[PDB]
């Protein structure tokens, strides 16, 4: 149950981190910029665990692995 | 294929609309605010189709329907 409580907590943080950085790019691409968003986003990076952060980091590389015809020595 | 192209387009807009309004609440709750985010969010409301907008509006009510022991609708 403790594991699942962490799943919810980290998931919420991963979402908020993405939501901020996404919204920041949408502003910066629309001219006016609010660097205050980045401060909150960087706060999420520390909040997100080292294990959880690696999981999201390997995800794009993970998709590239299970995309080809082979799973690449062996 | 045209239908699916719209699915992608509207889905992206629904996400961006949510990402902005979510990030706006996180700033407004952290003191300093940026009403510029709302301008971009309101722009998504016009971009989102009338049919697509209704779909997301009925979703919470849809969950409440399929939650009970009975389907009140006979």
Short mmCIF file of N, CA and C in Angstrom, two decimals:
data_model
loop_
_atom_site.label_atom_id
_atom_site.label_comp_id
_atom_site.label_asym_id
_atom_site.label_seq_id
_atom_site.Cartn_x
_atom_site.Cartn_y
_atom_site.Cartn_z
N UNK A 1 0.83 -1.20 0.00
CA UNK A 1 0.00 0.00 0.00
C UNK A 1 0.86 1.26 0.00
N UNK A 2 2.01 1.18 0.68
CA UNK A 2 2.96 2.29 0.70
C UNK A 2 3.52 2.54 -0.69
N UNK A 3 3.78 1.45 -1.41
CA UNK A 3 4.27 1.54 -2.78
C UNK A 3 3.26 2.27 -3.66
N UNK A 4 1.99 1.90 -3.54
CA UNK A 4 0.93 2.50 -4.34
C UNK A 4 0.71 3.97 -4.00
N UNK A 5 0.89 4.32 -2.73
CA UNK A 5 0.77 5.72 -2.33
C UNK A 5 1.86 6.55 -3.01
N UNK A 6 3.04 5.97 -3.16
CA UNK A 6 4.14 6.64 -3.84
C UNK A 6 3.86 6.76 -5.33
N UNK A 7 3.26 5.72 -5.90
CA UNK A 7 2.89 5.72 -7.32
C UNK A 7 2.00 6.92 -7.63
N UNK A 8 0.98 7.12 -6.81
CA UNK A 8 0.07 8.25 -6.98
C UNK A 8 0.81 9.58 -6.85
N UNK A 9 1.62 9.69 -5.80
CA UNK A 9 2.35 10.92 -5.50
C UNK A 9 3.32 11.30 -6.61
N UNK A 10 4.14 10.33 -7.04
CA UNK A 10 5.13 10.58 -8.08
C UNK A 10 4.46 10.84 -9.43
N UNK A 11 3.37 10.13 -9.70
CA UNK A 11 2.62 10.31 -10.94
C UNK A 11 2.07 11.73 -11.04
N UNK A 12 1.54 12.23 -9.94
CA UNK A 12 1.01 13.58 -9.89
C UNK A 12 2.11 14.60 -10.15
N UNK A 13 3.29 14.34 -9.61
CA UNK A 13 4.43 15.24 -9.78
C UNK A 13 4.95 15.22 -11.21
N UNK A 14 4.97 14.03 -11.81
CA UNK A 14 5.42 13.88 -13.19
C UNK A 14 4.51 14.64 -14.14
N UNK A 15 3.21 14.63 -13.83
CA UNK A 15 2.22 15.34 -14.61
C UNK A 15 2.40 16.84 -14.49
N UNK A 16 2.47 17.32 -13.25
CA UNK A 16 2.64 18.74 -12.98
C UNK A 16 3.92 19.28 -13.61
N UNK A 17 4.99 18.49 -13.54
CA UNK A 17 6.26 18.89 -14.14
C UNK A 17 6.12 19.08 -15.64
N UNK A 18 5.40 18.15 -16.28
CA UNK A 18 5.17 18.21 -17.71
C UNK A 18 4.24 19.36 -18.08
N UNK A 19 3.17 19.52 -17.30
CA UNK A 19 2.18 20.57 -17.55
C UNK A 19 2.80 21.96 -17.52
N UNK A 20 3.72 22.18 -16.59
CA UNK A 20 4.39 23.47 -16.46
C UNK A 20 5.30 23.75 -17.65
N UNK A 21 6.24 22.84 -17.90
CA UNK A 21 7.20 23.00 -18.98
C UNK A 21 6.52 23.10 -20.34
N UNK A 22 5.39 22.41 -20.50
CA UNK A 22 4.61 22.49 -21.73
C UNK A 22 3.99 23.87 -21.88
N UNK A 23 3.38 24.36 -20.80
CA UNK A 23 2.73 25.66 -20.80
C UNK A 23 3.75 26.78 -20.97
N UNK A 24 4.96 26.55 -20.48
CA UNK A 24 6.04 27.53 -20.59
C UNK A 24 6.48 27.71 -22.04
N UNK A 25 6.51 26.60 -22.78
CA UNK A 25 6.89 26.64 -24.18
C UNK A 25 5.82 27.32 -25.02
N UNK A 26 4.56 27.15 -24.61
CA UNK A 26 3.44 27.74 -25.32
C UNK A 26 3.39 29.25 -25.15
N UNK A 27 3.87 29.73 -24.01
CA UNK A 27 3.98 31.17 -23.77
C UNK A 27 5.18 31.74 -24.51
N UNK A 28 6.33 31.08 -24.37
CA UNK A 28 7.57 31.54 -24.97
C UNK A 28 7.48 31.54 -26.50
N UNK A 29 6.60 30.70 -27.03
CA UNK A 29 6.36 30.66 -28.46
C UNK A 29 5.32 31.66 -28.90
N UNK A 30 4.62 32.25 -27.93
CA UNK A 30 3.60 33.24 -28.21
C UNK A 30 4.10 34.65 -27.90
N UNK A 31 5.41 34.79 -27.73
CA UNK A 31 6.01 36.08 -27.45
C UNK A 31 6.36 36.28 -25.99
N UNK A 32 5.40 36.77 -25.22
CA UNK A 32 5.60 37.05 -23.80
C UNK A 32 6.00 35.81 -23.02
N UNK A 33 6.97 35.97 -22.11
CA UNK A 33 7.52 34.84 -21.38
C UNK A 33 7.41 35.01 -19.87
N UNK A 34 7.06 33.92 -19.19
CA UNK A 34 6.98 33.92 -17.73
C UNK A 34 7.91 32.86 -17.16
N UNK A 35 9.11 33.27 -16.76
CA UNK A 35 10.12 32.35 -16.26
C UNK A 35 9.76 31.80 -14.88
N UNK A 36 8.69 32.32 -14.30
CA UNK A 36 8.20 31.85 -13.01
C UNK A 36 7.75 30.40 -13.09
N UNK A 37 7.26 30.00 -14.26
CA UNK A 37 6.83 28.63 -14.49
C UNK A 37 7.98 27.64 -14.33
N UNK A 38 9.15 28.03 -14.82
CA UNK A 38 10.34 27.18 -14.76
C UNK A 38 10.75 26.89 -13.32
N UNK A 39 10.56 27.88 -12.45
CA UNK A 39 10.90 27.74 -11.04
C UNK A 39 10.08 26.62 -10.39
N UNK A 40 8.79 26.57 -10.73
CA UNK A 40 7.90 25.53 -10.21
C UNK A 40 8.23 24.17 -10.82
N UNK A 41 8.63 24.18 -12.09
CA UNK A 41 8.97 22.96 -12.79
C UNK A 41 10.25 22.34 -12.23
N UNK A 42 11.23 23.19 -11.95
CA UNK A 42 12.50 22.74 -11.38
C UNK A 42 12.29 22.18 -9.97
N UNK A 43 11.27 22.69 -9.29
CA UNK A 43 10.92 22.22 -7.96
C UNK A 43 10.40 20.79 -8.01
N UNK A 44 9.77 20.44 -9.12
CA UNK A 44 9.24 19.09 -9.32
C UNK A 44 10.35 18.08 -9.56
N UNK A 45 11.45 18.55 -10.17
CA UNK A 45 12.59 17.68 -10.46
C UNK A 45 13.21 17.14 -9.19
N UNK A 46 13.29 17.98 -8.16
CA UNK A 46 13.82 17.56 -6.88
C UNK A 46 12.82 16.66 -6.16
N UNK A 47 11.54 16.97 -6.33
CA UNK A 47 10.47 16.20 -5.70
C UNK A 47 10.39 14.79 -6.27
N UNK A 48 10.52 14.68 -7.59
CA UNK A 48 10.52 13.38 -8.26
C UNK A 48 11.74 12.57 -7.83
N UNK A 49 11.50 11.32 -7.42
CA UNK A 49 12.57 10.45 -6.96
C UNK A 49 13.59 10.16 -8.05
N UNK A 50 14.76 9.70 -7.64
CA UNK A 50 15.83 9.38 -8.59
C UNK A 50 15.46 8.19 -9.46
N UNK A 51 14.73 7.24 -8.87
CA UNK A 51 14.29 6.06 -9.60
C UNK A 51 13.18 6.41 -10.59
N UNK A 52 12.23 7.22 -10.14
CA UNK A 52 11.11 7.63 -10.97
C UNK A 52 11.57 8.50 -12.13
N UNK A 53 12.57 9.33 -11.88
CA UNK A 53 13.09 10.24 -12.89
C UNK A 53 13.78 9.46 -14.01
N UNK A 54 14.47 8.40 -13.63
CA UNK A 54 15.16 7.56 -14.60
C UNK A 54 14.16 6.81 -15.48
N UNK A 55 13.04 6.40 -14.88
CA UNK A 55 11.99 5.69 -15.60
C UNK A 55 11.46 6.50 -16.78
N UNK A 56 11.16 7.77 -16.53
CA UNK A 56 10.65 8.65 -17.58
C UNK A 56 11.73 9.01 -18.59
N UNK A 57 12.99 8.96 -18.15
CA UNK A 57 14.11 9.29 -19.01
C UNK A 57 14.38 8.17 -20.01
N UNK A 58 14.17 6.93 -19.58
CA UNK A 58 14.44 5.77 -20.42
C UNK A 58 13.26 5.43 -21.33
N UNK A 59 12.11 6.04 -21.06
CA UNK A 59 10.89 5.75 -21.81
C UNK A 59 10.99 5.98 -23.33
N UNK A 60 11.58 7.11 -23.77
CA UNK A 60 11.70 7.23 -25.23
C UNK A 60 12.64 6.18 -25.82
N UNK A 61 13.73 5.90 -25.11
CA UNK A 61 14.68 4.88 -25.54
C UNK A 61 14.04 3.50 -25.47
N UNK A 62 13.10 3.34 -24.55
CA UNK A 62 12.38 2.09 -24.37
C UNK A 62 11.45 1.84 -25.56
N UNK A 63 10.83 2.90 -26.05
CA UNK A 63 9.93 2.80 -27.19
C UNK A 63 10.69 2.45 -28.46
N UNK A 64 11.89 2.99 -28.60
CA UNK A 64 12.72 2.73 -29.77
C UNK A 64 13.19 1.28 -29.78
N UNK A 65 13.33 0.70 -28.59
CA UNK A 65 13.75 -0.69 -28.47
C UNK A 65 12.66 -1.64 -28.97
N UNK A 66 11.45 -1.47 -28.44
CA UNK A 66 10.33 -2.35 -28.78
C UNK A 66 9.60 -1.93 -30.05
N UNK A 67 10.28 -1.21 -30.94
CA UNK A 67 9.65 -0.74 -32.17
C UNK A 67 10.13 -1.52 -33.39
N UNK A 68 11.42 -1.84 -33.41
CA UNK A 68 12.01 -2.53 -34.54
C UNK A 68 11.52 -3.96 -34.70
N UNK A 69 12.12 -4.67 -35.65
CA UNK A 69 11.80 -6.07 -35.87
C UNK A 69 12.59 -6.95 -34.92
N UNK A 70 13.69 -6.41 -34.40
CA UNK A 70 14.54 -7.14 -33.46
C UNK A 70 14.76 -6.36 -32.17
N UNK A 71 15.10 -7.09 -31.11
CA UNK A 71 15.40 -6.49 -29.82
C UNK A 71 16.90 -6.55 -29.57
N UNK A 72 17.62 -5.57 -30.11
CA UNK A 72 19.07 -5.54 -30.01
C UNK A 72 19.52 -4.74 -28.78
N UNK A 73 25.01 -7.54 -29.43
CA UNK A 73 25.39 -8.95 -29.50
C UNK A 73 24.16 -9.84 -29.73
N UNK A 74 23.45 -10.15 -28.65
CA UNK A 74 22.26 -11.00 -28.73
C UNK A 74 21.08 -10.26 -29.35
N UNK B 1 -9.77 8.39 -42.59
CA UNK B 1 -8.47 8.97 -42.29
C UNK B 1 -8.60 10.43 -41.87
N UNK B 2 -9.57 11.12 -42.47
CA UNK B 2 -9.86 12.50 -42.12
C UNK B 2 -10.35 12.60 -40.68
N UNK B 3 -11.17 11.62 -40.29
CA UNK B 3 -11.69 11.55 -38.93
C UNK B 3 -10.54 11.40 -37.93
N UNK B 4 -9.61 10.51 -38.24
CA UNK B 4 -8.47 10.26 -37.36
C UNK B 4 -7.54 11.46 -37.27
N UNK B 5 -7.40 12.20 -38.37
CA UNK B 5 -6.58 13.41 -38.35
C UNK B 5 -7.18 14.43 -37.39
N UNK B 6 -8.50 14.48 -37.35
CA UNK B 6 -9.19 15.39 -36.44
C UNK B 6 -9.04 14.93 -35.00
N UNK B 7 -9.07 13.61 -34.80
CA UNK B 7 -8.89 13.04 -33.47
C UNK B 7 -7.56 13.49 -32.87
N UNK B 8 -6.49 13.40 -33.66
CA UNK B 8 -5.17 13.83 -33.22
C UNK B 8 -5.16 15.33 -32.91
N UNK B 9 -5.71 16.11 -33.83
CA UNK B 9 -5.72 17.56 -33.71
C UNK B 9 -6.48 18.04 -32.48
N UNK B 10 -7.70 17.53 -32.31
CA UNK B 10 -8.54 17.92 -31.18
C UNK B 10 -7.96 17.43 -29.85
N UNK B 11 -7.38 16.23 -29.87
CA UNK B 11 -6.76 15.66 -28.68
C UNK B 11 -5.61 16.53 -28.20
N UNK B 12 -4.80 16.99 -29.14
CA UNK B 12 -3.67 17.86 -28.83
C UNK B 12 -4.15 19.17 -28.22
N UNK B 13 -5.26 19.69 -28.74
CA UNK B 13 -5.83 20.94 -28.25
C UNK B 13 -6.43 20.77 -26.86
N UNK B 14 -7.07 19.63 -26.62
CA UNK B 14 -7.67 19.34 -25.32
C UNK B 14 -6.60 19.24 -24.25
N UNK B 15 -5.46 18.69 -24.63
CA UNK B 15 -4.32 18.56 -23.73
C UNK B 15 -3.73 19.93 -23.40
N UNK B 16 -3.45 20.71 -24.44
CA UNK B 16 -2.88 22.04 -24.27
C UNK B 16 -3.78 22.93 -23.44
N UNK B 17 -5.09 22.83 -23.67
CA UNK B 17 -6.06 23.61 -22.91
C UNK B 17 -5.98 23.27 -21.43
N UNK B 18 -5.87 21.98 -21.13
CA UNK B 18 -5.78 21.51 -19.76
C UNK B 18 -4.44 21.88 -19.13
N UNK B 19 -3.36 21.72 -19.89
CA UNK B 19 -2.01 22.02 -19.41
C UNK B 19 -1.87 23.49 -18.99
N UNK B 20 -2.48 24.38 -19.76
CA UNK B 20 -2.42 25.81 -19.47
C UNK B 20 -3.19 26.14 -18.19
N UNK B 21 -4.46 25.77 -18.16
CA UNK B 21 -5.32 26.09 -17.02
C UNK B 21 -4.84 25.43 -15.73
N UNK B 22 -4.18 24.29 -15.87
CA UNK B 22 -3.59 23.62 -14.71
C UNK B 22 -2.39 24.41 -14.20
N UNK B 23 -1.52 24.82 -15.12
CA UNK B 23 -0.32 25.57 -14.78
C UNK B 23 -0.68 26.95 -14.24
N UNK B 24 -1.80 27.50 -14.70
CA UNK B 24 -2.27 28.80 -14.24
C UNK B 24 -2.71 28.75 -12.79
N UNK B 25 -3.33 27.65 -12.40
CA UNK B 25 -3.78 27.47 -11.02
C UNK B 25 -2.60 27.26 -10.09
N UNK B 26 -1.55 26.63 -10.60
CA UNK B 26 -0.36 26.35 -9.81
C UNK B 26 0.43 27.63 -9.54
N UNK B 27 0.36 28.58 -10.47
CA UNK B 27 0.99 29.88 -10.27
C UNK B 27 0.15 30.75 -9.33
N UNK B 28 -1.15 30.80 -9.58
CA UNK B 28 -2.06 31.62 -8.80
C UNK B 28 -2.13 31.15 -7.35
N UNK B 29 -1.82 29.87 -7.13
CA UNK B 29 -1.78 29.31 -5.79
C UNK B 29 -0.42 29.50 -5.14
N UNK B 30 0.56 29.92 -5.94
CA UNK B 30 1.91 30.15 -5.44
C UNK B 30 2.18 31.64 -5.29
N UNK B 31 1.12 32.44 -5.31
CA UNK B 31 1.23 33.87 -5.15
C UNK B 31 1.19 34.62 -6.46
N UNK B 32 2.37 34.90 -7.01
CA UNK B 32 2.49 35.63 -8.27
C UNK B 32 1.77 34.90 -9.40
N UNK B 33 0.99 35.65 -10.18
CA UNK B 33 0.21 35.06 -11.26
C UNK B 33 0.59 35.59 -12.63
N UNK B 34 0.07 34.94 -13.66
CA UNK B 34 0.29 35.33 -15.05
C UNK B 34 -0.98 35.07 -15.85
N UNK B 35 -1.78 36.12 -16.04
CA UNK B 35 -3.07 36.00 -16.73
C UNK B 35 -2.89 35.75 -18.22
N UNK B 36 -1.65 35.83 -18.69
CA UNK B 36 -1.33 35.57 -20.09
C UNK B 36 -1.65 34.12 -20.46
N UNK B 37 -1.53 33.22 -19.49
CA UNK B 37 -1.85 31.81 -19.70
C UNK B 37 -3.31 31.61 -20.07
N UNK B 38 -4.19 32.37 -19.41
CA UNK B 38 -5.62 32.27 -19.65
C UNK B 38 -5.98 32.64 -21.09
N UNK B 39 -5.26 33.61 -21.64
CA UNK B 39 -5.49 34.05 -23.01
C UNK B 39 -5.26 32.91 -24.00
N UNK B 40 -4.20 32.15 -23.77
CA UNK B 40 -3.88 31.01 -24.62
C UNK B 40 -4.88 29.87 -24.42
N UNK B 41 -5.35 29.72 -23.18
CA UNK B 41 -6.31 28.68 -22.84
C UNK B 41 -7.66 28.96 -23.49
N UNK B 42 -8.08 30.22 -23.45
CA UNK B 42 -9.34 30.63 -24.05
C UNK B 42 -9.30 30.46 -25.56
N UNK B 43 -8.10 30.58 -26.13
CA UNK B 43 -7.90 30.40 -27.56
C UNK B 43 -8.15 28.94 -27.96
N UNK B 44 -7.87 28.03 -27.03
CA UNK B 44 -8.09 26.60 -27.27
C UNK B 44 -9.57 26.25 -27.27
N UNK B 45 -10.35 27.00 -26.49
CA UNK B 45 -11.79 26.76 -26.39
C UNK B 45 -12.48 26.98 -27.73
N UNK B 46 -12.04 28.00 -28.46
CA UNK B 46 -12.59 28.29 -29.78
C UNK B 46 -12.09 27.26 -30.79
N UNK B 47 -10.84 26.83 -30.61
CA UNK B 47 -10.23 25.85 -31.50
C UNK B 47 -10.89 24.48 -31.37
N UNK B 48 -11.18 24.08 -30.13
CA UNK B 48 -11.89 22.83 -29.87
C UNK B 48 -13.29 22.88 -30.45
N UNK B 49 -13.65 21.86 -31.22
CA UNK B 49 -14.96 21.80 -31.84
C UNK B 49 -16.09 21.75 -30.83
N UNK B 50 -17.30 22.06 -31.29
CA UNK B 50 -18.47 22.05 -30.41
C UNK B 50 -18.80 20.64 -29.95
N UNK B 51 -18.57 19.67 -30.83
CA UNK B 51 -18.84 18.27 -30.51
C UNK B 51 -17.80 17.74 -29.53
N UNK B 52 -16.54 18.06 -29.78
CA UNK B 52 -15.44 17.61 -28.93
C UNK B 52 -15.53 18.23 -27.54
N UNK B 53 -15.97 19.48 -27.48
CA UNK B 53 -16.07 20.20 -26.21
C UNK B 53 -17.15 19.58 -25.33
N UNK B 54 -18.24 19.15 -25.96
CA UNK B 54 -19.34 18.52 -25.24
C UNK B 54 -18.91 17.17 -24.68
N UNK B 55 -18.09 16.46 -25.44
CA UNK B 55 -17.59 15.15 -25.03
C UNK B 55 -16.84 15.22 -23.70
N UNK B 56 -15.95 16.19 -23.58
CA UNK B 56 -15.17 16.36 -22.36
C UNK B 56 -16.03 16.91 -21.22
N UNK B 57 -17.10 17.60 -21.58
CA UNK B 57 -18.00 18.18 -20.59
C UNK B 57 -18.88 17.12 -19.95
N UNK B 58 -19.25 16.11 -20.73
CA UNK B 58 -20.13 15.05 -20.25
C UNK B 58 -19.36 13.94 -19.55
N UNK B 59 -18.04 13.95 -19.71
CA UNK B 59 -17.19 12.90 -19.14
C UNK B 59 -17.31 12.71 -17.62
N UNK B 60 -17.32 13.81 -16.84
CA UNK B 60 -17.49 13.55 -15.40
C UNK B 60 -18.88 12.98 -15.09
N UNK B 61 -19.90 13.48 -15.78
CA UNK B 61 -21.26 12.99 -15.61
C UNK B 61 -21.37 11.56 -16.11
N UNK B 62 -20.54 11.23 -17.10
CA UNK B 62 -20.50 9.89 -17.68
C UNK B 62 -19.93 8.89 -16.68
N UNK B 63 -18.92 9.33 -15.93
CA UNK B 63 -18.30 8.47 -14.92
C UNK B 63 -19.25 8.20 -13.77
N UNK B 64 -20.04 9.20 -13.41
CA UNK B 64 -21.00 9.06 -12.32
C UNK B 64 -22.11 8.09 -12.70
N UNK B 65 -22.41 8.02 -14.00
CA UNK B 65 -23.44 7.12 -14.49
C UNK B 65 -22.99 5.67 -14.36
N UNK B 66 -21.79 5.39 -14.87
CA UNK B 66 -21.24 4.04 -14.90
C UNK B 66 -20.53 3.65 -13.60
N UNK B 67 -20.90 4.28 -12.50
CA UNK B 67 -20.24 4.02 -11.22
C UNK B 67 -21.15 3.27 -10.26
N UNK B 68 -22.43 3.63 -10.25
CA UNK B 68 -23.38 3.03 -9.34
C UNK B 68 -23.68 1.57 -9.64
N UNK B 69 -24.63 1.01 -8.90
CA UNK B 69 -25.05 -0.36 -9.12
C UNK B 69 -26.08 -0.43 -10.24
N UNK B 70 -26.72 0.70 -10.51
CA UNK B 70 -27.72 0.78 -11.57
C UNK B 70 -27.41 1.90 -12.56
N UNK B 71 -27.97 1.76 -13.76
CA UNK B 71 -27.81 2.77 -14.80
C UNK B 71 -29.11 3.54 -14.99
N UNK B 72 -29.30 4.58 -14.18
CA UNK B 72 -30.48 5.42 -14.27
C UNK B 72 -30.40 6.34 -15.49
N UNK B 73 -31.26 6.08 -16.47
CA UNK B 73 -31.29 6.88 -17.69
C UNK B 73 -32.64 6.76 -18.39
N UNK B 74 -35.98 3.62 -17.42
CA UNK B 74 -35.64 2.20 -17.33
C UNK B 74 -34.28 2.00 -16.68
#
